[PDB]
Amino acid sequence: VLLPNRPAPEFKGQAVINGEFKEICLKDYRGKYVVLFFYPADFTFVCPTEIIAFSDQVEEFNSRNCQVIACSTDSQYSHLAWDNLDRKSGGLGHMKIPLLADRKQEISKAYGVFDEEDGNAFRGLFIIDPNGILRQITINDKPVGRSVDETLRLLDAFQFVEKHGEVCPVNW
Amino acid sequence: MVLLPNRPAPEFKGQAVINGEFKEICLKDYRGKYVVLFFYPADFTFVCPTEIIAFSDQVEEFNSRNCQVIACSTDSQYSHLAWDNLDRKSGGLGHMKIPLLADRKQEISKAYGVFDEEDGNAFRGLFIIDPNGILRQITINDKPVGRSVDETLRLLDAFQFVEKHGEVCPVNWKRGQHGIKV
Amino acid sequence: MVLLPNRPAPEFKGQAVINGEFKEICLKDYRGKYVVLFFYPADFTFVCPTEIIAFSDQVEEFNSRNCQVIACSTDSQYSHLAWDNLDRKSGGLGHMKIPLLADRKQEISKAYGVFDEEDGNAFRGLFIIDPNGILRQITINDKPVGRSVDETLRLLDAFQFVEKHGEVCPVNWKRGQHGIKVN
Amino acid sequence: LLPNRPAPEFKGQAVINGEFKEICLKDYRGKYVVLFFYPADFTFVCPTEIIAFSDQVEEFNSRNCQVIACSTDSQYSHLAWDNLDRKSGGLGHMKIPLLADRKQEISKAYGVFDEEDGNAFRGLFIIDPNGILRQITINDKPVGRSVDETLRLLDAFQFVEKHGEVCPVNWKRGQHGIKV
Amino acid sequence: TMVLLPNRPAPEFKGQAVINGEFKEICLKDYRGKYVVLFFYPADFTFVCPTEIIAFSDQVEEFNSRNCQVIACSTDSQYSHLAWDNLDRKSGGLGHMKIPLLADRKQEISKAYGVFDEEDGNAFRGLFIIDPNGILRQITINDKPVGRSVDETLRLLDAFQFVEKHGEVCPVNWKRGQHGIKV
Amino acid sequence: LLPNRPAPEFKGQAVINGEFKEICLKDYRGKYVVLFFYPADFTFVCPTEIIAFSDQVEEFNSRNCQVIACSTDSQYSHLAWDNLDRKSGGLGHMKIPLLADRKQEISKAYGVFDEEDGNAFRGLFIIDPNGILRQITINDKPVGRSVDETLRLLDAFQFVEKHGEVCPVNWKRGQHGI
Amino acid sequence: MVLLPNRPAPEFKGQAVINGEFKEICLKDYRGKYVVLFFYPADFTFVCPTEIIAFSDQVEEFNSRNCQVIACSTDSQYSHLAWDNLDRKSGGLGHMKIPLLADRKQEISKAYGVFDEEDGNAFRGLFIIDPNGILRQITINDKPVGRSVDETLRLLDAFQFVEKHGEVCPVNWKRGQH
Amino acid sequence: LLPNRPAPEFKGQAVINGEFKEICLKDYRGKYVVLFFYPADFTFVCPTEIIAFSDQVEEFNSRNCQVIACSTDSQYSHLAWDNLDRKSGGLGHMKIPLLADRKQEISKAYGVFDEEDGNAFRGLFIIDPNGILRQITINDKPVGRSVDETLRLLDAFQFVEKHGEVCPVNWKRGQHGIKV
Amino acid sequence: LLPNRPAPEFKGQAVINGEFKEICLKDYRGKYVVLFFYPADFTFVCPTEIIAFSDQVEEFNSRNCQVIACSTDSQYSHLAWDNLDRKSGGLGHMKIPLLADRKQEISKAYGVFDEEDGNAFRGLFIIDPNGILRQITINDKPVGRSVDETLRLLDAFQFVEKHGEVCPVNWKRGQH
Amino acid sequence: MVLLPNRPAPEFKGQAVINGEFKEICLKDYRGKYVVLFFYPADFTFVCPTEIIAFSDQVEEFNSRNCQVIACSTDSQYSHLAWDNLDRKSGGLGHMKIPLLADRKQEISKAYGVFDEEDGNAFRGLFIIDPNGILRQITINDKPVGRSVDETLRLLDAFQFVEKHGEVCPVNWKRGQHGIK
């Protein structure tokens, strides 16, 4: 049962970072906020636009001490090819955020974003606080994408509370 | 565990406060319209009214978009009413243009997955539901932290665009903006 | 089914409003004392305040008898305080001399068996608890009909009588009257 | 066991006027019933309660209420207790029915049964004309009930049933109820 | 408990009995060293039951000299038993009984000896002869309308004491003192 | 196993007048039935009882009762015993049916079956014409029963059946009940 | 359902009639000796005695062979005695030179699987048990058809051969051969 | 397994006079059956029985009895064994059916199968013309059977069948028998 | 998964000659089917097997056999891999259908699914015109298969289906 | 369902015929060596002996490669022996240079999942087991169609190349060829 006040599910797996394979886990990221967002498939249409947007804006999350990780049920071998593929040919260009592979479906299932019809995940966005605890849960229907600006907004409010202890109003 | 989009949204029937009166509303009354259903933990709290006041003041932007906004909580109807009739300067809601849905039995909060056993009251979810009663968007916050009337409006525009034009909405998608075909 | 006396009363812990402030109270904080715990369905209702007020005005009679009176409802602490802050002229609680216990998790109402699945509201029960936490009297009234402060005190007197004198109290027993010796 | 629920059914041999007659809860439809329990025949607090209720019977007869006393003793023990005069420690002669539960079925259904004992805790259940439970009182054995509070509770439920109104704290006959 | 069987330890009973107009708590281990004739009756203030109890009480010294305690049991409370005893026989009472009246109000005892009736709430008429070591010997169950035989109860008791002492066995229709069959 | 309930059914092979016949409880409907068990054929206390009833048959006959003796022995062990002379240690020849239950079904149905040895305890059961049990009597093996008490109880049950009255303690014939 | 003969034989313990008095015996008593344990349906029947009489007439042939023949049935020890003490003229056993084992509790016949649930009796079994308690031969016949002392002798001869000489025995193998 | 009963059904591939045929217990209805099991093909003691039963087959055929040998070996093992001459350790050419049970069902059904070495003990089961179990013989493996005893047992079961009487101990053919 | 029984059914998206097509085992009745699995797209040993079966495709077509390659990759990944030039490590444009299992249920039915990684072991299943299984090959991942042995095997089963005669050890074309 | 590779192969222990005498063999005995364990339905069959004879005629190709070939069927040991003894003109096995493993109990065929409940016989499996007892290959043929010694050798070569050189063999790979990193 996925709720904001509880420890986030541990994810572990193989990711593509700077054109190489590295093995990452949620516990590595302690001390930082983590934005973990799922997309349905590699070589899709709406999906690359999101990953590219977050990558181009990665420094916004870096300055905010947040690590953005993009997970999908494709293999690391697709993640790599898709990264090696230039944006004109339909590829990802080269990405500044890790692309995490769930070939086991374990990660998409643990976060409850897994779709039994497709075999691939919905689009979740989960903001995990530095202590490994879930904060925000966003799940979008596949046709409709997310907002880098709203993720930045939320990220800023949660940080505002962990520091000030005042609680954040609407439209913040 | 957590709700999924592209699946029929959980049914809610409840007693609600509309224009200072009690009405019994359900989900199927709003068929033909989108429904933004958003939860808050408690009446006579602080972060809570600021969101409802905002959704209420902006309600015409949802109305023009063929959407109903319904706030729900685990408080009774007489709390919803008392809070409503109280002026905002007294920390009340002022008089409210959006229905306040009382879930006393915890049924609706537990159905949408936003109920937590620690408080006895709801996390703030925001769910967007299509005219056929199908779930589209899911948002849940840790409640120091509130939601955005502009992002709800945005998402609203996006799903309406998809259903209308059969195209899909990219990242950061806006109004009068291009989608992608199939 | 429902409770039986001469058995330890169900425990409770929760957020209560006392003198316009929040405080955590539990059944065990009241040990060495009798406890009258009574339930009402909702805040900002009609029959509910009349009872709360009544028990509050008469508090001293419960205090001199070594009893703590505690009102409980499935509303919250925040709903409770807003009610207690209001003027009675405005339909409020005035200001309350007894703790208002928030049942919000619903688990106090269920423990005492007074919980109504239809409205998600508590019925009106009243429970007399001895200084060791034993259950003595049980009353549950249907919602539209309210309770009696003087009958509660009458029963409270009776149980203290049999406690002190080890006697038994006959029907319609009145304060100071002495009962039957089971000697 | 809550109010605004159908009251449990009871059926059994009762002592009425000094004869045995089988009674059931449905017989009393249209009438209010006060069903009250006592632990034992030939004891101390028990007769005083029955006697008081019997002396006051007409006060209930004016409310369209039937009072019934139940316990886990036999009909044969009930009868001999009635035949015994009060000066002898008996019931005198009763204007009220004594319902016997030898099977413990009835005590257990109303949840007043004590398994350390074999006999009932003293409960009082006011049941409305349609067989729907209204009030529930259960006293620990050493402490008996009040005839006068039972009349008070009774007056209130009838006042709600009539005016549709609701009865506040300490409500007695000839007082204003709060409008719905 | 389809049926009890002889040559097995008798079911234990501990209860509250009326002995000489007073309440005593007695158990089966208390009478260890002695035989026990334990017999059940359905109800106090009835027809056949007193005639049975009065008859065992009038003949009680025949059992005392045979080193056997007689106990009557029923599902009535100790308070019924005491009122039935204290009542004179003219009124339908018990006179005053020289045997203990055992109250089993929990039905445990009558259920344990198998004589309890579900359609009733009171016991059938059992008669169980129990040897000094707690072993069951004879089992008699009569339908309620028909009563028992104090003289036949005495005959069997005599028989088991003969068997016990002389290591012989008692034939059909065996009368007290007669030689039985060796080995 | 209680007096107010219908009795267990038994169907078995019995020895009636030196021959084998299959009998069952429903045959005896309309008549009273005294069914009693003995542990073993060819023992000391068992025949005394069987003979006692077999000599007394006309008291049961005139009372509309049939007396049947059951045991875990075979019908063949029964018949041999019944061929034997009492002088020889046998049964002589019996006026009452000897019911063989070799399957233990009957003894177990009536709850008198001992698992320590394969022999039944000696019980005695009185069944009214309608198949309803009345008396249960079970004795430890070394101690045998009384024809006179069985006869006494017979009169008692028939009395209450007939006159509607209940029989007091120590009741005998020529006495009025309650 | 059946027990198989590479395996330790089921234990039996009961009351036996030996020499005319009751003795309690078991299967571990006869360790060091071979055992032939055979079952018959009932005492005081026609076909049963002929088998026991025969084997008991053959005793020294089983004795010289270090084997103990044992009869068993579901009858009581008291039926065994009466039958043994009976003359052969009345259908009795005469006085037997082999033990008569009683199974009252039926557990021996059930352990060896010869027990018939239809009648209370057992079929005719024959089980040859080696000195260490292991089962070797299993013979079971329907009631109407009896056994052979010669064949039991042959198998015994063969089973004793195969252990001693370590050679396997062919079909129709006789008192010594090869 | 007890012989008042219906015998367990067997159906399998048998080798009969050089051919593979499917046979079942129901086929031999109307006839007696001697069904005996042996542990292995190309063993020692087994041939001796199979051959002696084969050479003596006319005594069974005149008695209206079919002799069937069953093993857990394949039909292919059987045929080759039956092709092998006796001097060479084979079955010669034998006149009796060899029933092959590969899946162990049959041997398990008659209870002569042991999971130890995975091949059958030697049972011999006599089955009346209606398919009813009559005699059960089970030999430990080292020790073989008797054709002459099986012939005796068979003569007795038929005698009982025809004349309604029984067979005493050591009954021979044309002996008296005991009337019931 | 024994040879003599009807094969597990598959249904799903495939990339056939640049298009997405829904295929299932029953579509191929009247034809033999070689359904072979590989762990992942954009791997190393995997493309060599597909390209070889694709290059030899006419050998199977004249033998009345359909070759389908299944992976646990998406149809979208299959598409790009086949849009990828061989020199660049892709499939060129390959002449056999690429069957997509996202739900893993095809690889689970045929038994070749690995829990260790989300990828299939390389199985090769030969299925007859009536949908009955014929032969099972399962290779450990690091070692690939042979197009000539599949061709040999396929030839043999067609020989028994035709002549009723049995193919012995090392049987090659038209022996008997 | 099915045996998977890169997993420890099921243990087998039985009575086998080697050289014409019985011997007790087991999988663990062969540790340190590669094992090809292959199944056939029956003794005294037609397709079956051809395969057995072929592996026993080719036995040196396997010994050179450090592999023991083992033939298992559901027949007993005495059937294996009589078959091995029978001359090939009578349908016999000639005499075998490879162990004939008897599964009377069916445990082995059931462990390797090649057991056919229909005939009680076994299918034709061929399993390549590595020196550490791990299963690198599963080959199961429908009965009417027999296996290939050369493909078995090819596969054997391949799993040895990958273990030695840590590379991965492509399609159609034979001895002397290169591989991929």
PDB file of N, CA, C and O in Angstrom, chain B residues 41-46 73-76 78-79 82 104-106 110 115 117-121, chain C residues 41-46 73-76 78-79 82 104-106 116-121:
ATOM      1  N   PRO B  41      -6.670  15.953   5.133  1.00  0.00           N
ATOM      2  CA  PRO B  41      -6.703  15.234   6.415  1.00  0.00           C
ATOM      3  C   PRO B  41      -7.808  15.676   7.371  1.00  0.00           C
ATOM      4  O   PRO B  41      -8.544  14.821   7.866  1.00  0.00           O
ATOM      5  N   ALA B  42      -7.946  16.977   7.613  1.00  0.00           N
ATOM      6  CA  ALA B  42      -8.822  17.425   8.689  1.00  0.00           C
ATOM      7  C   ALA B  42      -9.461  18.795   8.473  1.00  0.00           C
ATOM      8  O   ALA B  42      -8.937  19.649   7.761  1.00  0.00           O
ATOM      9  N   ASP B  43     -10.635  18.975   9.060  1.00  0.00           N
ATOM     10  CA  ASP B  43     -11.235  20.296   9.179  1.00  0.00           C
ATOM     11  C   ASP B  43     -10.596  21.043  10.346  1.00  0.00           C
ATOM     12  O   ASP B  43     -10.113  20.427  11.301  1.00  0.00           O
ATOM     13  N   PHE B  44     -10.590  22.370  10.259  1.00  0.00           N
ATOM     14  CA  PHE B  44      -9.990  23.207  11.289  1.00  0.00           C
ATOM     15  C   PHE B  44      -8.483  22.967  11.413  1.00  0.00           C
ATOM     16  O   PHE B  44      -7.879  23.238  12.447  1.00  0.00           O
ATOM     17  N   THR B  45      -7.883  22.458  10.343  1.00  0.00           N
ATOM     18  CA  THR B  45      -6.433  22.459  10.203  1.00  0.00           C
ATOM     19  C   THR B  45      -6.008  23.660   9.350  1.00  0.00           C
ATOM     20  O   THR B  45      -6.817  24.545   9.073  1.00  0.00           O
ATOM     21  N   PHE B  46      -4.738  23.709   8.965  1.00  0.00           N
ATOM     22  CA  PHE B  46      -4.167  24.921   8.381  1.00  0.00           C
ATOM     23  C   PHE B  46      -3.894  24.825   6.878  1.00  0.00           C
ATOM     24  O   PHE B  46      -4.452  25.598   6.098  1.00  0.00           O
ATOM     25  N   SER B  73     -12.909  14.406   2.950  1.00  0.00           N
ATOM     26  CA  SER B  73     -12.134  14.206   4.157  1.00  0.00           C
ATOM     27  C   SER B  73     -12.890  13.210   5.021  1.00  0.00           C
ATOM     28  O   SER B  73     -13.995  12.796   4.671  1.00  0.00           O
ATOM     29  N   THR B  74     -12.300  12.826   6.146  1.00  0.00           N
ATOM     30  CA  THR B  74     -12.914  11.833   7.021  1.00  0.00           C
ATOM     31  C   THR B  74     -13.776  12.478   8.111  1.00  0.00           C
ATOM     32  O   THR B  74     -14.329  11.793   8.967  1.00  0.00           O
ATOM     33  N   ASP B  75     -13.893  13.800   8.061  1.00  0.00           N
ATOM     34  CA  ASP B  75     -14.725  14.532   9.009  1.00  0.00           C
ATOM     35  C   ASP B  75     -16.201  14.294   8.700  1.00  0.00           C
ATOM     36  O   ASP B  75     -16.550  13.874   7.597  1.00  0.00           O
ATOM     37  N   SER B  76     -17.067  14.547   9.676  1.00  0.00           N
ATOM     38  CA  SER B  76     -18.503  14.416   9.457  1.00  0.00           C
ATOM     39  C   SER B  76     -19.022  15.575   8.609  1.00  0.00           C
ATOM     40  O   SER B  76     -18.254  16.443   8.197  1.00  0.00           O
ATOM     41  N   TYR B  78     -21.330  17.755   9.674  1.00  0.00           N
ATOM     42  CA  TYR B  78     -21.560  18.892  10.557  1.00  0.00           C
ATOM     43  C   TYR B  78     -20.256  19.651  10.827  1.00  0.00           C
ATOM     44  O   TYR B  78     -20.273  20.834  11.174  1.00  0.00           O
ATOM     45  N   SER B  79     -19.128  18.971  10.653  1.00  0.00           N
ATOM     46  CA  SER B  79     -17.830  19.623  10.735  1.00  0.00           C
ATOM     47  C   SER B  79     -17.578  20.387   9.448  1.00  0.00           C
ATOM     48  O   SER B  79     -17.107  21.526   9.462  1.00  0.00           O
ATOM     49  N   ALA B  82     -19.895  23.405   9.753  1.00  0.00           N
ATOM     50  CA  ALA B  82     -19.381  24.380  10.711  1.00  0.00           C
ATOM     51  C   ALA B  82     -18.180  25.133  10.154  1.00  0.00           C
ATOM     52  O   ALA B  82     -18.097  26.357  10.262  1.00  0.00           O
ATOM     53  N   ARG B 104     -17.264   9.535   6.704  1.00  0.00           N
ATOM     54  CA  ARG B 104     -17.202   9.234   8.126  1.00  0.00           C
ATOM     55  C   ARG B 104     -16.708   7.815   8.361  1.00  0.00           C
ATOM     56  O   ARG B 104     -15.971   7.539   9.312  1.00  0.00           O
ATOM     57  N   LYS B 105     -17.134   6.918   7.478  1.00  0.00           N
ATOM     58  CA  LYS B 105     -16.851   5.497   7.618  1.00  0.00           C
ATOM     59  C   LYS B 105     -15.459   5.130   7.099  1.00  0.00           C
ATOM     60  O   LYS B 105     -15.049   3.971   7.187  1.00  0.00           O
ATOM     61  N   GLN B 106     -14.741   6.116   6.561  1.00  0.00           N
ATOM     62  CA  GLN B 106     -13.399   5.886   6.023  1.00  0.00           C
ATOM     63  C   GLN B 106     -13.434   5.136   4.684  1.00  0.00           C
ATOM     64  O   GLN B 106     -12.396   4.906   4.061  1.00  0.00           O
ATOM     65  N   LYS B 110     -10.178   4.876   2.092  1.00  0.00           N
ATOM     66  CA  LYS B 110      -9.606   3.538   2.013  1.00  0.00           C
ATOM     67  C   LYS B 110      -9.708   2.976   0.590  1.00  0.00           C
ATOM     68  O   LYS B 110      -8.814   2.259   0.132  1.00  0.00           O
ATOM     69  N   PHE B 115      -6.005   6.687   2.751  1.00  0.00           N
ATOM     70  CA  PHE B 115      -6.230   6.604   4.195  1.00  0.00           C
ATOM     71  C   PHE B 115      -5.032   5.979   4.908  1.00  0.00           C
ATOM     72  O   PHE B 115      -4.521   4.949   4.475  1.00  0.00           O
ATOM     73  N   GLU B 117      -3.542   4.558   8.759  1.00  0.00           N
ATOM     74  CA  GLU B 117      -4.015   4.051  10.041  1.00  0.00           C
ATOM     75  C   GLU B 117      -3.419   4.788  11.247  1.00  0.00           C
ATOM     76  O   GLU B 117      -3.900   4.634  12.370  1.00  0.00           O
ATOM     77  N   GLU B 118      -2.377   5.583  11.024  1.00  0.00           N
ATOM     78  CA  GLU B 118      -1.784   6.360  12.113  1.00  0.00           C
ATOM     79  C   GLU B 118      -2.686   7.509  12.561  1.00  0.00           C
ATOM     80  O   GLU B 118      -3.006   7.644  13.744  1.00  0.00           O
ATOM     81  N   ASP B 119      -3.084   8.332  11.597  1.00  0.00           N
ATOM     82  CA  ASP B 119      -3.903   9.513  11.838  1.00  0.00           C
ATOM     83  C   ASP B 119      -5.359   9.168  12.089  1.00  0.00           C
ATOM     84  O   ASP B 119      -5.972   9.661  13.033  1.00  0.00           O
ATOM     85  N   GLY B 120      -5.916   8.332  11.222  1.00  0.00           N
ATOM     86  CA  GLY B 120      -7.347   8.117  11.209  1.00  0.00           C
ATOM     87  C   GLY B 120      -7.944   9.020  10.153  1.00  0.00           C
ATOM     88  O   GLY B 120      -9.124   8.929   9.817  1.00  0.00           O
ATOM     89  N   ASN B 121      -7.102   9.901   9.622  1.00  0.00           N
ATOM     90  CA  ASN B 121      -7.499  10.818   8.552  1.00  0.00           C
ATOM     91  C   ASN B 121      -6.622  10.744   7.293  1.00  0.00           C
ATOM     92  O   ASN B 121      -5.511  10.200   7.329  1.00  0.00           O
TER      93      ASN B 121
ATOM     94  N   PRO C  41     -22.139  10.613  19.165  1.00  0.00           N
ATOM     95  CA  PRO C  41     -21.888  10.384  17.736  1.00  0.00           C
ATOM     96  C   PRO C  41     -21.075  11.470  17.030  1.00  0.00           C
ATOM     97  O   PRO C  41     -20.119  11.125  16.335  1.00  0.00           O
ATOM     98  N   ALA C  42     -21.414  12.744  17.212  1.00  0.00           N
ATOM     99  CA  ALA C  42     -20.813  13.785  16.380  1.00  0.00           C
ATOM    100  C   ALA C  42     -20.675  15.150  17.052  1.00  0.00           C
ATOM    101  O   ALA C  42     -21.411  15.494  17.973  1.00  0.00           O
ATOM    102  N   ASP C  43     -19.689  15.911  16.596  1.00  0.00           N
ATOM    103  CA  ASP C  43     -19.569  17.318  16.964  1.00  0.00           C
ATOM    104  C   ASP C  43     -20.558  18.151  16.147  1.00  0.00           C
ATOM    105  O   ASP C  43     -20.951  17.764  15.043  1.00  0.00           O
ATOM    106  N   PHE C  44     -20.964  19.289  16.702  1.00  0.00           N
ATOM    107  CA  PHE C  44     -21.897  20.196  16.036  1.00  0.00           C
ATOM    108  C   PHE C  44     -23.271  19.567  15.797  1.00  0.00           C
ATOM    109  O   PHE C  44     -24.013  19.990  14.918  1.00  0.00           O
ATOM    110  N   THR C  45     -23.606  18.560  16.596  1.00  0.00           N
ATOM    111  CA  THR C  45     -24.944  17.979  16.585  1.00  0.00           C
ATOM    112  C   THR C  45     -25.835  18.656  17.632  1.00  0.00           C
ATOM    113  O   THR C  45     -25.463  19.684  18.200  1.00  0.00           O
ATOM    114  N   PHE C  46     -27.018  18.089  17.862  1.00  0.00           N
ATOM    115  CA  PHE C  46     -28.026  18.704  18.727  1.00  0.00           C
ATOM    116  C   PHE C  46     -28.036  18.168  20.163  1.00  0.00           C
ATOM    117  O   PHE C  46     -27.778  18.910  21.111  1.00  0.00           O
ATOM    118  N   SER C  73     -15.725  10.864  21.131  1.00  0.00           N
ATOM    119  CA  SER C  73     -16.433  10.881  19.861  1.00  0.00           C
ATOM    120  C   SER C  73     -15.455  10.568  18.736  1.00  0.00           C
ATOM    121  O   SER C  73     -14.243  10.705  18.903  1.00  0.00           O
ATOM    122  N   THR C  74     -15.983  10.179  17.581  1.00  0.00           N
ATOM    123  CA  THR C  74     -15.142   9.759  16.464  1.00  0.00           C
ATOM    124  C   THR C  74     -14.658  10.961  15.670  1.00  0.00           C
ATOM    125  O   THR C  74     -13.989  10.812  14.655  1.00  0.00           O
ATOM    126  N   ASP C  75     -15.007  12.157  16.134  1.00  0.00           N
ATOM    127  CA  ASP C  75     -14.461  13.378  15.554  1.00  0.00           C
ATOM    128  C   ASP C  75     -12.994  13.508  15.963  1.00  0.00           C
ATOM    129  O   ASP C  75     -12.463  12.663  16.686  1.00  0.00           O
ATOM    130  N   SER C  76     -12.339  14.574  15.515  1.00  0.00           N
ATOM    131  CA  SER C  76     -10.918  14.757  15.789  1.00  0.00           C
ATOM    132  C   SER C  76     -10.671  15.726  16.936  1.00  0.00           C
ATOM    133  O   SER C  76     -11.606  16.264  17.519  1.00  0.00           O
ATOM    134  N   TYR C  78      -9.018  18.510  16.431  1.00  0.00           N
ATOM    135  CA  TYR C  78      -9.203  19.800  15.779  1.00  0.00           C
ATOM    136  C   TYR C  78     -10.679  20.172  15.656  1.00  0.00           C
ATOM    137  O   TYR C  78     -11.044  21.346  15.735  1.00  0.00           O
ATOM    138  N   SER C  79     -11.529  19.167  15.474  1.00  0.00           N
ATOM    139  CA  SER C  79     -12.967  19.389  15.426  1.00  0.00           C
ATOM    140  C   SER C  79     -13.478  19.663  16.838  1.00  0.00           C
ATOM    141  O   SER C  79     -14.356  20.504  17.053  1.00  0.00           O
ATOM    142  N   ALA C  82     -12.449  23.266  18.069  1.00  0.00           N
ATOM    143  CA  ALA C  82     -13.274  24.265  17.395  1.00  0.00           C
ATOM    144  C   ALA C  82     -14.649  24.344  18.045  1.00  0.00           C
ATOM    145  O   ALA C  82     -15.229  25.426  18.173  1.00  0.00           O
ATOM    146  N   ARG C 104     -10.579   9.319  16.473  1.00  0.00           N
ATOM    147  CA  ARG C 104     -10.498   9.332  15.004  1.00  0.00           C
ATOM    148  C   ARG C 104     -10.104   8.004  14.332  1.00  0.00           C
ATOM    149  O   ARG C 104     -10.625   7.679  13.268  1.00  0.00           O
ATOM    150  N   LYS C 105      -9.178   7.249  14.912  1.00  0.00           N
ATOM    151  CA  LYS C 105      -8.851   5.926  14.360  1.00  0.00           C
ATOM    152  C   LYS C 105     -10.016   4.933  14.506  1.00  0.00           C
ATOM    153  O   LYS C 105      -9.983   3.837  13.953  1.00  0.00           O
ATOM    154  N   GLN C 106     -11.048   5.344  15.241  1.00  0.00           N
ATOM    155  CA  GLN C 106     -12.256   4.545  15.474  1.00  0.00           C
ATOM    156  C   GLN C 106     -12.065   3.423  16.493  1.00  0.00           C
ATOM    157  O   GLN C 106     -13.032   2.779  16.882  1.00  0.00           O
ATOM    158  N   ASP C 116     -21.026   2.493  15.342  1.00  0.00           N
ATOM    159  CA  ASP C 116     -22.076   2.253  14.343  1.00  0.00           C
ATOM    160  C   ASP C 116     -21.534   2.313  12.916  1.00  0.00           C
ATOM    161  O   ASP C 116     -21.119   3.370  12.436  1.00  0.00           O
ATOM    162  N   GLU C 117     -21.559   1.167  12.245  1.00  0.00           N
ATOM    163  CA  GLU C 117     -21.033   1.037  10.893  1.00  0.00           C
ATOM    164  C   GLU C 117     -21.868   1.801   9.867  1.00  0.00           C
ATOM    165  O   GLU C 117     -21.398   2.076   8.765  1.00  0.00           O
ATOM    166  N   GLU C 118     -23.106   2.132  10.216  1.00  0.00           N
ATOM    167  CA  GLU C 118     -23.965   2.844   9.276  1.00  0.00           C
ATOM    168  C   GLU C 118     -23.525   4.294   9.058  1.00  0.00           C
ATOM    169  O   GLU C 118     -23.253   4.706   7.927  1.00  0.00           O
ATOM    170  N   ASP C 119     -23.437   5.057  10.144  1.00  0.00           N
ATOM    171  CA  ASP C 119     -23.047   6.463  10.060  1.00  0.00           C
ATOM    172  C   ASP C 119     -21.548   6.702  10.250  1.00  0.00           C
ATOM    173  O   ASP C 119     -21.059   7.799   9.994  1.00  0.00           O
ATOM    174  N   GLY C 120     -20.819   5.675  10.675  1.00  0.00           N
ATOM    175  CA  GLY C 120     -19.427   5.855  11.053  1.00  0.00           C
ATOM    176  C   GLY C 120     -19.324   6.661  12.335  1.00  0.00           C
ATOM    177  O   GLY C 120     -18.278   7.227  12.660  1.00  0.00           O
ATOM    178  N   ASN C 121     -20.437   6.700  13.063  1.00  0.00           N
ATOM    179  CA  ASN C 121     -20.554   7.443  14.318  1.00  0.00           C
ATOM    180  C   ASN C 121     -20.769   6.536  15.519  1.00  0.00           C
ATOM    181  O   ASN C 121     -21.321   5.438  15.400  1.00  0.00           O
TER     182      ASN C 121
END
